[PDB]
Amino acid sequence: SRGSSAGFDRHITIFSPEGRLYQVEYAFKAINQGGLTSVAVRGKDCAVIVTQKKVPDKLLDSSTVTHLFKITENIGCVMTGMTADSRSQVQRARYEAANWKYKYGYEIPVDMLCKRIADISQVYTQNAEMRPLGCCMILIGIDEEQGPQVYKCDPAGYYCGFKATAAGVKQTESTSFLEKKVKKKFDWTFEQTVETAITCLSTVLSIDFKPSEIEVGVVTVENPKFRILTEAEIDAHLVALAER
């Protein structure tokens, strides 16, 4: 062990002498390739999605540039990593979700959707014909009697619910930040949750971004329908953070 290799343990999803799966690992680095970072926070009455929106070109219809997807009307998500893979996974989520309601009679629980996408990826992890997807998925929405939910699933099969989390280049820096502010945790209101998310991203990227440099998605106990903030009202939050 200690970083050893044997056979093709570095080319296909088979065990290494240590009992690791390098391809699954190489799949994580693949996420960062996009150079972006994403954060999601769980308020007491809502859930928030925030990510960079690096649009270095003026030739792109900024409208078509997103990492925020509407899965259901009550389920929204944020992708981090290889794009094409991501759109793909988004489509599968939309599918598994539309199918769940048709087959069972009720909206799929954010809890279940993520467990599903997760289970799928697990296969790529055990089958050699294909590589895992180099992307990460964060879903959010309001459950029946569980209030707001925030889940994220791995290119490794892992999935879980969090008070808040991140993905992308500054994931590890974003966690240290959040988990430190979740202890001082004031009243996790809608504004604070949104505010806490923006800063976590701004300070780890040290940017104080304009309203066009980020995108924010939100789901509310009083407005369960997934909502993507306008550039206008995004700034309304930015200004609010500058008053101090």
Residues 4-33 that bind Mg ion (CB under 5 A): 12-13
Structure-block tokens of residue 44? 């007491």
Binding mask 135-174 for another protein (x = CB under 8 A): ---------xx-----x--x-xxxxxxxxxx---------
| CB-count burial class (<10 Å; 0-12, 13-18, 19+) for 239 | exposed
Cα 9 to chain centroid distance, Å, stands at: 29
Contact 197, 48 (CB under 8 A): yes
Q: Which amino acid type is present at position 94?
A: R
Interface pick for another protein out of 54, 99, 191, 223 (rule CB under 8 A): 99
Question: Which of the listed partners (another protein, Mg ion, none) does 222 bind, with a CB threshold of 5 to 8 Å by partner kind?
Answer: none
Structure-block tokens of residue 243? 């008053």
Question: Which of the listed partners (Mg ion, another protein, none) does 80 bind, with a CB threshold of 5 to 8 Å by partner kind?
Answer: none
Comparing CB distances to Mg ion, the nearer of 154 and 213 is 154
Q: How does DSSP classify residue 116?
A: H
Binding mask 169-198 for another protein (x = CB under 8 A): ------x--xx--xx---------------
Task: Report the half-sphere exposure of 94 (CA within 13 A, side-chain side).
Answer: 10
Comparing CB distances to another protein, the nearer of 35 and 206 is 35
> Which residues bind to Mg ion, rule: CB under 5 A?
12-13, 84, 128
